[PDB]
Every structure is written in structure tokens, then in C-alpha cells.
């Protein structure tokens, strides 16, 4: 009778499965639009990342404060991991629509109140803050309010970080303090409260003052967060669906008018059709219109019926739920100053049903789109999913839940789906999220506490420079030379040619035609066998290489031998190998004169071995050919070392106090006496002790390409076994030596790269790493290479200020010729070191010329000098 | 039958289609590795963008110089559109391998000389620079050398912009100058010289000193370039295929030894198996091994044979193409050998195997290129442009390739087109385009310069406002004045109305508690009659009281009426003119209180205030120093507290009165026409109120988008945007709403996002289109902000001078959707006020509650007067 004419009147608020399924297809399209990098800014449904990546583990423990803000009751809670305590606090409408300062002032006063009450005012606890509004966050411990919704409207919060505003409020008091703050939306918090009981909970649903839902989406579909691994909770903010007009064929004149009367007009239009803040008024407006048209109350209207907000959603609930539902309808209408007729009262009851059945069916529509998406993500033929729910409408309306459960299960019949009702509220799930924020905060702090040991301050680097300086004196003084770590070895450096370059990445033989300088070469591999074997086999091979090269070259010539190891030179052509370094370990060579060994090996098969030089010395000469001022050699490659022009007065191991001689410092051994043990870490010790030459080349082991990877690797390994990286499992391939080679350290730290890019390279090296594992590894490397650069820089600082003090000069212009694969591949080493020298040696103007022709050119030039000498 | 003894020994050098197919599957994977943003950094095949989006067009014309560098012959050319003239110049081996400076001086010299040859030295011509090496570029007119390859090794060039280096070379001369330089790989130039002849040319191949190919790829697959519209030529740099060891089961021990003796060890590993620089030496290394194992020449080995580079690629070519075996004898003999007729048979076969693997390796990677182009299109009729010594000169290389590849990709109609003019022709074509783009950009900039105002220009606008402010305040001049300086007569529970902004509101203000409801004003009413409008207004007022639960109760009402009104008192205001979009009949010239009262009769108006004035008061409720009101929304206007002795239209010289400036009409006497552009004129002349509100029309949110749109239309029809296509949607008034203008200019948006916003508006845009649109909006909103600042600067300095102060501290209350939505307007105006009015310390307070609050507060101070 009345029932069937209300249904014809409100025909367009009674929604078929056909239109419901259409609505959910549109919503789906809005989900994708919101998640896409390029369409997201134009998206009504914002699909906001939350950085909640999982439901609880069960490993969460701790004591927490919480706040629950945005629903019908503002609540301050205390949670232990579950023991909970809470108290509801009132927020006056004038504060709800006052200044942010006022708002957060209030929250902070309430919080203080509660801490006193529980007697914890002096504890500094972490805080799980449920903030039921759309927020921009790039991590758990921040959230920038995008927009207020519902009945909030404080000036100056929108665009600001609610964690900062609340801290600032607290610190305007001094009363108390808090630790880390994690911020979750209420949908997220509710998912987390429920997933605490059923870890399969993947959706969070709120039907209360407003309506919204989050869900767990695949990271590969979340364009706005770098990463493709696993899932992350997306707060959809679905209340703003249709804010672009997408549901105008669904919206009626009554929704339009609710909108015209709203605090946030134009906005949250889907919500305005569903949520409890709006439902009662929707029904007041349907009644008012019907009464103006003379279809109810015989065309009469009280002023209470016309007065906004007078018909409550509580009244919808009550009317639809009381056993005398007609009598309850009558009771409400009489509080509105009417005398309705049994007929009127059946119409009123029926509008309540129509209004609230649409609310349930709209949610069903969009929920059905989210379940379909989740079904496609899992790949599975029919799906299993748990939705966690809170809110006054779902909890208190007598039928909403049922209608929702039914409508959904019909719209998606290939779904198995359990609805869990939240009993404890969002604060619990918000404590679970802060469990993790805290953990992550703590692990980070632990990682940088370790990496702080590998960071040196200006003053530590002045001290490293000073120590280098007293070690330089020690090895130059003949009185102390035998006992010195830094040997400061006299080099005796004061046509067509052959050259050898032995001891870096490549062994080359070279033809160096001087007239300018024309250079040829061939690289010759030295097999692991020969390299591990006897002096005879090595030099046999060297000679075999020379012979091949002469044929290759279509050709007996004078020879400059670049031999990049510590040698005692008694003259330019007698060099005795003190010890092998780097990776060389051939027998019957140390303590022998390598020219003899070479000559012996040539006899077996002749040539004119005129000079033997270190790579530093060869590189200095290659570079000084371009530049009068080049007085120093530096190598930063496989090993590291430096030579420079010392004064003969200071070179006590060579008779003569006039003129100059180049000194090969062999600085890699700096620290072999203990003189750097306060700067050395447990990782430097591990690299040293597990090396071929333990207790030796300690400086170089902190600097050079052969060793950094191993500093890094030993660190990464330490972190993982402390649970701070790689989910705590030590890949048997991280147990593997030498994986972190100069190329894959210089790449990882390139700053033209983005993070997935860096992740690409780590992936590519055969270590399986998340974007989180990869920012760590990248920092561990940046740190190890920065220290290397700076130590090298402090060593060099020592060298330039020495040359300057040796000449009594007040300032020094000088060039340093440089080579080595680390120096020339690594994005920052070169600059960090040049910067370090600039800071630590102010009275020196050092220029670093990178060698483009290798040591073999400069070796050719000292041989050519030696030759002209002996003629 | 050495022929079969050779094949079993050189077995891993004879490639079955099974291993060519694998190679191509691998190469396709490396193609996708290099194109992908996350994997590009570590891709061995770099897949480098060239910024060539198209083969020639017939639209190319001009006189270009050209350089051709990195092949066997360095050339300088002159191209006119085709007439060509060229000269080859030697680059010595010590210069090729000397220093950057030295290499570039030499190129500068040879250029200078060529210009003397052709007598064309006075000229400043653009130049197409074919530079045959891997280069990073983000535009046609730059190229940063990634790495030397082949025989080059000049220091101080890797990492630098070869256009910058060549420029420093020429100015170190002074001898001459050049215009715009565009740089292309030689694959790209070779694709482009053939594309002039055949416009279906989509690949560019080079098999010569080195080997490399480029192709037209879909922009949607080029992650490394922002955009997905159309295509772009990608310089694959496939010579480096295998550099990460991805071909180490194909590569042999000879390929390894070639690499150990090369200038660039470990790089260009795929090239080293193919190209001419390497093929002769490859064959020599095979002869030298076989001889050593006593398999040829009875193991008797000459020094020539053992000497690097004595077996040339010309020797391979000659042998395969002349009696194969008498030519091999002759060559082997020249290398000091004494060959049997069997040795001569091996040698000739070795040559075949090595030159056939070369062609086959190319076919395999080229197969994959064609499959990819197939998929892109959706079906395959492609032309390949080719060049390089090995292809041009060697007898069977081309045919081996055409066969191997046409066999490898069966569903394909692939014309191979040999280039006879060389890269320079196609590089001049690309340069034609670079020049054009430079020119179009220069035209656009020149236009927008008209909307950019200097500090001095803005001081002049401030000054001119100052004089119109005086003009309007004075009784002797006020009837002439465009800036009207209207006296406002501003010195429990209330109603308010808020009319003339984006939303019409009725309010209940409880003295502060505020409620409101928006009511729509349909087009019927908007362009209807005064009677219908006020009837509507009164229907809404009546609705509101019911809604607010006080039906028919008579409250004192504050009417915010956002139009120029002569106020004879607070409760008597005569509408001078409609502005913005209002147009109801029989209203202008009438007392809006009377028209209100009348429509009430058909079913207590204490005060009528402008929105600037209500906003001044809404804001002053919380800040004593707020004595100015500003609106930048649909329109723009300001009001402020004047000294009664300055207000000549009101008798009295004591105290202060608010003056509603109605500054939107500044310029209606012609006083800004030197700052007004053709697009301002157009916006005015197609407005409802032509000739009126001219200042406002350069500032406010109803108009700014129409100025933008007009600039975009002018650019478009001038060929400078949207491919000169005037999208029909572009012709739709009002599309550039304030929310979109604000969004477009956000510093958060990547460019693909800006573009996405425009396609949402309904405008088809390339990323390059979006660059231009964002800038035009940026320039227009910046001028708007700045003009507003010049205006406010006048007003605040005025309040100071009026009180003989030397420093003023003052708040401005502000409202309007442009002011509050736009990312930079607020800031840019505040800055401008700061710069133009330095003796004043101006704070701007944003109204949170709308004009209605202020209007109700004025009313409450009215209701006080009369008690
Ligand atoms: O608006 P209502 O009915 O209070 O429902 C939503 C609220 O429900 C509460 O149970 C939760 O703790 C809140 O986080 C949530 O916002
Ligand atoms: O150890 P690396 O990386 O190969 O670099 C150092 C070597 O670099 C080469 O460039 C020099 O020619 C060698 O003399 C030197 O030993
Ligand atoms: O290296 P080659 O054999 O000269 O072949 C490739 C060259 O061929 C020429 O014809 C082109 O004009 C050059 O741009 C290109 O470098
Ligand atoms: O034209 P807009 O953008 O709506 O802004 C101006 C309007 O802003 C409203 O907020 C004010 O209350 C009105 O009085 C004013 O006219
Ligand atoms: O409180 C329930 C929902 O209300 C509104 O939709 C809010 O904007 C949203 O953040 C929240 O989840
Ligand atoms: O390769 C550079 C350096 O490596 C090692 O440290 C050698 O000991 C040293 O002599 C050499 O200069
Ligand atoms: O000249 C042919 C090719 O030679 C080398 O491979 C260059 O790296 C490449 O850029 C060029 O196209
Ligand atoms: O709304 C702001 C301004 O818009 C228009 O310029 C009106 O002329 C003016 O009265 C108003 O203050």
C-alpha cells in the first residue's frame, strides 16, 4: 500500500544487481587510475600508500600509547603486547572547527590527562596514532593530511605532518614526551586489529561517521612506491568516488542537497550516500519533500521536521530494529512535533529501509571490485579473503551487516569471504604497526652505529695525516729505517724502447717509440698456475711474452720494467724484491733481484734491461711528461701507494746531500706497526687476518680495489647475522670472497641512479635484495669508499705538506700523476680525496693528473734518460 | 679437401641457424635490457636515444655545413636542400690518439679550409655533425661522448659535449662562426640519407671500420625518454653486445686474442667479430696458429705473417672476389711465405668462414630488430639504410646477409637500400629540424616576453594605481575615474548572504558560531530579471530559516554583494554595473536593498557590504592590524581603511572609512594598454563586459585561463604547438579552470602527469606540448600575481603616506579560490609587495570563514549604532 508507493517514489535509490555490478566495474577503473603514476593526480579515488606491508607476525611486543581520532569518539589508549586501557575524550565542535594549534593543544592535554590517570606521565613511549583522514605518507612515522572529511575543519593542518604538529603541541607543554609515532588510517588500524586474530585479513572496512576501506595490493601495482616485492596496504579513500561526476547518474536530488548543506561541499560524495553522518538527514530530506508534496502527514510539516539534523541515523537503526518498528517510527516523528498515522509510520519505516539498504549495497559494489582484484592477484579459481570491519553503522544498525554480507557474496559468487567484526578498535592494530616502526627505527640506528666507526672527522684525518708524516720520517732516517713500516724506498730516479707493466690488473708488454711518444702494447694473461708457481715459471712466461710481442711488432731493445711491488733498489738496474703484495705468491722470488731472475730467464731462451721502477714512479713520469709540475705518483687500483721527489739530504740511505731523488713510499704498509689500530674496525681485522699477507699492507687494505669489497662484505655479513639485513639468512654466495669488485662498487654508488636501478645491480651480482636491503648495501659501500678516499687524501695531504716544508716554501703548487682502476671508475673517490687534500693541506695547490697511457710510458722515459747517461 | 679440414678446425666459427636464432633471442633480451629504465644502467647494449623521431619530410630546407667523423674517411661537407660538395681530410694517427684539444683544432682547421675552398667563410651556417661513437644526448644539439671505440683515443673528450668542444675550437680561431649544431651517430645519418629517397626506411646499418645499427622504436618502449607518442630512432650500439660475457660460448680464442691486442680491451666484443678493422687480423691469427701447429706452410713462419696487421680486410675482399687461389698465393707470398696450392686453399676458406660469420652475426641481431619492428606495427615491409666499407666493398657480404636475414625473418618484405651520398645528407636533414625547433622555441619565448614585467614596469603599475586611487577618491574627478574608491560606510543572532563568488550562500551567524547552506542559481535566474533573481534569493532565505529551524523569524541581515555599488549609506547601495558572469536585467542603477525588500513583500536588511569588505572584517576579528581586504577568486578587488579627510565624497574629516576600490576596473581608461597584449584584448572583447574590468581580467580566475587558451591558440595556428592542429576543445571557453591552472603548475608533478592532466581536460598532448603549456600558464599566473602585488603595494604605501608614518605594519585579509589553490600566486604576490613596498611590513591572512562572518559583524555593529 504505502510501502509499494514509496518504492515507486524512491525507485532510483533502489539499486539492482545490474547497476550494482556496473558501479563496481567503474570503481575498479578508479582503483587503477589512483594507483598509476601518471593518472594518480587526476584520480578521485586516491589509493593512498600506507607502508603497512603485513598483518601481525606474532613477534610484536612492547608498551604503547595510542590516539584514535576521526570517528564518533576521540580516544587515548594504552596497549601492551594484549592488555589495553582507554578513555574517551570530548572534542567541542568549536575546536573541531577551530585552529590546528587549538586542536592539537587539546589532543596533547587529553593525552597528558590520561598518562597522569594511568601514572605513566614520565615514561617515554612510542605512539600508535589512528588518524581517520586521507594522508600522504612515505613512511609509517609521518602523515601529511591531504584533506579533512566528515565534521572536521581546522585551519592550517591540511598539507602538514600530523606527527610534527602533535610533537609541537606536546613540546608547548613540557609535561611529558613520546618516542616514535606511527600513523595509520582507521581502515588500516582496523585491518590490523582483526588480522591480529586472523592473519588472512586483507581488507579494512569502516562504515561509521564516514566510510572507507583499505586493502593489501601487490607492490608491482603500486606505482607510487618503488618496489615490486610482496604487498602493501592501500587506503583507497573511496568516500571520494564520484567526486569527479562518475556517479551522477546514481546520485539523486537528495544527495545533491545533503551536499549543498555539507561542511565539505563537492567532496566525499560516495560517502555522503552511505555513512552514518549523512543517512539520518538523507531520510529527513526525503520526508520533508514528500510532506511538501502532500504525500505524508497530509501535507503538513512541523518546524522540527524542517530543521537540519533532527532525524538521526540512530533513529534509522532504532526504527528498523525495534520489535514495534511502526511504534518506534511514531515515537521519532512525535519528537519531531508530528502526529502521524499508521500509514505515515509505515512510509517512514520504509524510507529508513530504502536509505540504509542502499548504503549497504553501495559498499557491496565497491567491496566486490576489491575482492575481484584480490582474486586476480592470487591467481586462484575461486578466492578466500577476510575483511575486518568497524564503525557505528555496521556494528549498531540491526540489518546493514547482513544485507552487506549477502549482497557482496552474490555479486562475487566465486568468492569465499569472512567478515570479522573488530571488538577492540583501531588502537590495537595501530600498536601493532608501531611495533614495527619502532623495530625498523631501532635496526636502522644499530646499522648506523656500526657504520659510525668507519666515518672519520676532520680532526681524525689531521691525525692520520700527522701519523703518516712521522712514519715518513721514520723510514727516511737510516737510524730507524729497518724498523719502519713505511719504507720510503730510494728508487734512483733523479729512441725505441720496450716496457713491461707487471702487478696491476693487466700484464702488458709495450713498444715505446720516442721522437712525441708513440706507444703500442699487448696484454698477456698470466694463468693461476704460473702465478702461484715458481719464479722460474713466472719469468719464463714473462720472457715468452716479450718474444711473442717482438714478433707481433715485426721486430733487441732497452727495457723499462714496471714492477709494482716493494723492491730494494741498490741502483736503477739492481732491484731486490722485499715481499710480494696484492695477490702475487710465487716462490724463489722474494729476497732475490728481479733483474737477475729476468736475465737468467732470458738466457734460457737477449735484451737490455736498463731500469726497474714501481708503478707509482712510472705513472709519475708518464704524467710529468705532460706537466713540469708533476712531482708525485699515486696509485689507487688493485693496491695503493705513492712516490714523490724527496731531497737527497733527507734520503739518508743514499750518500749525497745535493739534488733530488724519487722515493717509493710503499704506504700500503702504513699501520703495520699498530699506528692506526684505533681507526681500524673488526671488519678491517677480518679482511687482514683472512688475507695472504696477514698483518701486512694495512693502510692499503682500507683503501684499494682488492680489499674494499671485503670490508663491505664482512659488514653486510655482520648485519645479517644481527638480523639487520637480508632477513637474517647468509646466502652461501655472500660467504664468497671477492664478489664486490671495483666495477660493482663504483656502479652501486653512482648518483645518476635510482634505487630499483641499484637494486638491479645487486640482483645482477646474485644477491637477492629488496629495495630496503639495497639502500643499506649502497650506504655500507658509500661509507667504505668515502673512508678510503679520505684516508688516501690524508696520506697525500702528508706528502704535499712534506714537499712544501722540505723546500721551506710558504705555499706549494704541485701536480700528482694518478692511475688505478678504483680511482678512474669510482664516481666520488676522486673528488672526496681531492676535497680531503684541499682541507687538510691548506697551504698547497694540488692538481691531480689522471694518467691515460699507463706506467709503461714513464718507464720508457727513465730508461731513455739512463741510456743517454751511459753514453 | 683442406676445405673440410679447415671447417672442422674452424668449427666454432661456422654458425648454424640454431645458434644464430639463439644469438637473436639473446639480443632481443639485451634490447629490452637497454630500453628499460631500471636495467639500462647496466645494459651492455645501450639503446641510446637520438632524438630523431622521423625520416625526412620534404619540409627540410637550408644551407648546412656538415662533418663526418669516425669512419675510414673524415669528411667536411656542404649540403643545400639536394646539392652536396665534400672534401676528405686525413686525421693523423697521433692526432686520433692525441688530445681532445688537438683533435678538435684539426677539425676546426679542416672546416675553416673547406669554407675557404667554397668561399663561404663569412657565413654563419648550421652544421650536422655525424660523430660515429656512443654519445649521451637529451636533445639533437648536444652529445656527450660515452666512449671512444675503433681506432680513436683522444684524452679529455669522453664525458664532454662534442658540440661544446667544437665550439671552443672555432672561437680559438675567430676565423669564422657556425650556428646550431645537431649531432647524429652515422647509423642515424645513414638511416636518414636513405630515408630521403625511401621514406619507409626504419633501420640504419653500418658494417665498415666498426659495426652498429639503429632503428625506429616506439616511444612507449623507450623508458629512457619521457613520452609515449610516436617513435624515435634508437642507436643500439650493438658493437658492445657480449661485453658482459653474454656471447662467451660463441666467441673463440682468436676473438680473445684480437681483444688483448686492441686499443679498447674488453669493449666492443661483438664488433670485433664482425667489422673491417678486425676481420683481416682475425684471419692472420688463424693462419698464425695453424702454421704453429704444423698444419699449414709446413710450419715455416715468416716475420710478416707474425707482424700485426699485415693481413688486411682488403686481402679478404680481394681473395674472395677475383681465381680465389692465385690471389691467395700472391697475398701469402707478399707476407714472405712460400705457400702450396693447399695452403692457398685453406687461406681462401678461412677468409670465407670469417667474412661469412661476420655477415651472419649481423643477420642474427638484425633478425631480432625486424621481429621487434614487426610486433610494433602488428603484422612486415621495412627498408634498411646501409653503408660501410665491408658491405659496400666486400664481394659476398651483402648477399650473405640479405639471404641469412630474409631466411631468418620469413614473413618480411625487406628492401636493403645502399647509401651513395653518406651520412652528411641525412645529418643535414636532422639539422634542418634542430634549427626549426630552435626557431619555434625562439618565437614562443618572444611572445611570452610580452607577459613578463620588470621591476620597473611593476613600479610603474604601482604608480599608475596610486594616481587612479587619488583620482577616484576626489569629488572633482571621481565621476571620470575608472578606479572608483567607493565609500562603504564601514568605520546576538544574524543572517548573512554571500552573493557573487563561486557559491551563493545564506548564513546564520551566532555571536562565533556559523552555519550555511549553498543554493544554486540556475541559468534561468542568472540571466533572467532582477525580480526573478531576488525572488530566488528570497525563496532561499526562506528555505534557510526553516532549515535552521526558525521559520519566518525576522533577523537582521548582512548582505555580501560582490559587485560595484554606490553606497549612500550602509543600507542603501546602488548596483553600478554587473561584473564577472552576472547579467540579470533591470538591476544596474537600482538600489539592491529595495529590490530585495520588494521580493520579500511578494512573499530586516541592516547592511550591504562588498566581499573585500566582509573579508577585511572576517579577518580583522582575529587580527587588529587587518585594515585591507583582497579578493583573488572569480574576480579581483581590494578595499582598505581610508582617512575620512581623503574621502571627499563623504562630508567629514575625522576618523576612517573603508573604501571599496573596485580595482578590477583599473585600466578601463586605457592606462594599462601598454602592458596589455593581443590576448588580453581578445579576452576582453569576447567577454560579457567588453571594455570593463580590464585589470581584473589580467589577474582573476575567471579570466586567466582564457588568456592561456588564447596564447595556446595563437601558438598552435602559428605552427608552434599541437602540430598546428586547433583541437576543437581548445576552442571551448572556460576549460582552463582555476583548479587546473593550479594543478598544472605544481612542483610535484612529473611531466607525464602534467600531460595526463591535459588529456583529462580533453587536449591531446605530447610531453613537449606539455612543457609549453605549463610555461604559458606559469608566465600568465606569474604576471597575474605580480600585477596584484603592484596594486597592493600602492595600497599599503598609501595607508602609510596617509598617516605620515615611515614604517607600516599591516595585515591584509584574503579570500578567493585562485589565491588559495594556486601553488605560487600567494608567494609571488607577497614577494612583489615586499620588493615594491619596502617600508611596509605586510602580512596576508587567509579567511577561513568566508565573507559572511565579516558581513554579520558589521551588521552587529550597525544594530549597535541604533541603540
Ligand atoms: O565513526 P565511528 O562510528 O566512530 O566508526 C569508525 C571508528 O570506529 C572505532 O571503533 C575505531 O577505533 C576508529 O579508528 C574508527 O574511526
Ligand atoms: O691495479 P690496477 O687497477 O690495474 O691499477 C694500477 C696499474 O694501473 C695501470 O694503469 C698502470 O699501467 C700500472 O703500472 C699500475 O700497476
Ligand atoms: O668506417 P667506414 O668503412 O668508412 O664506414 C662507415 C662510414 O661510411 C660513410 O659512408 C658514412 O658517411 C660515415 O658517416 C660512416 O662513418
Ligand atoms: O570567487 P571565489 O573564488 O569563490 O572567491 C571569492 C568569494 O570567496 C568566498 O569565500 C567569500 O566568502 C565571498 O564573499 C567571496 O566573494
Ligand atoms: O572514518 C572513516 C573514513 O572517513 C572518511 O572517509 C575519511 O576521509 C577516511 O580516512 C576514513 O577511513
Ligand atoms: O699497484 C700499486 C701498489 O700496489 C702494492 O701496494 C705494491 O706494494 C706497491 O708497490 C704498488 O705501488
Ligand atoms: O661506425 C660504426 C660504429 O662504430 C663503432 O661501433 C661506434 O661505437 C658506433 O657508434 C658506430 O656507429
Ligand atoms: O569578488 C571580488 C570582486 O569581483 C569583482 O571585481 C567585483 O567588481 C567586486 O565587487 C568584487 O569585490
Numbering used by the authors:
A (entry chain A): 17 to 97, 105 to 517, 526 to 546, 552 to 591, 595 to 644, 648 to 913
B (entry chain B): 17 to 97, 105 to 345, 347 to 403, 406 to 517, 526 to 545, 553 to 644, 650 to 913
Q: Could you share sentences copied from the article?
A:
Hexokinase, the first enzyme of the glycolytic pathway, catalyzes the irreversible rate-limiting phosphorylation of glucose to glucose-6-phosphate (G6P). The elevated rates of glucose metabolism, tumor progression, and the high patient mortality has been predominantly associated with the overexpression of HK2 in different cancers. HK2 is predominantly co-localized on the outer mitochondrial membrane (OMM), where its translocation is facilitated by an increase in the cellular glucose concentration. The mitochondrial translocation of HK2 not only gives it preferential access to ATP required for its function and relieves feedback inhibition by G6P, but most importantly, suppresses apoptosis.
For in vitro biochemical characterization of the mitochondrial conformation, a variant lacking the MBP, the first 16 amino acids of the N-terminus (Δ16), will mimic the HK2 conformation on the mitochondria. Only the Δ16 variant of the WT-HK2 crystallized in complex with glucose and G6P at 2.45 Å. The crystal structure of human HK2 is a homodimer with two structurally identical N- and C-halves of equal size linked by a long eight-turn linker helix-α13. Similar to the overall fold of mammalian hexokinases, the N- and C-domains have an identical α/β fold that is conserved amongst the hexokinase family. Each domain is distinctly folded into large and small subdomains that each contains a five stranded mixed β-sheet. The active site is formed by a cleft between the two subdomains, where their β-sheets enclose the active site and the helices α5 and α13. The N-half of HK2 is linked to the C-half by helix-α13 that protrudes out of the active site of the N-domain. Helix-α5 that is perpendicular to the linker helix-α13, carries the catalytic residue D209 of the N-half. The glucose-binding pockets in the N- and C-halves of HK2 are identical to other members of the hexokinase family, with the requirement of an aspartic residue for catalysis. The catalytic residue D209 or D657 of the N- and C-domains, respectively, forms H-bonding interactions with the 4-OH and 6-OH of glucose, and a lysine residue, K173 or K621, align the γ-phosphate of ATP with the 6-OH of glucose for its phosphorylation.
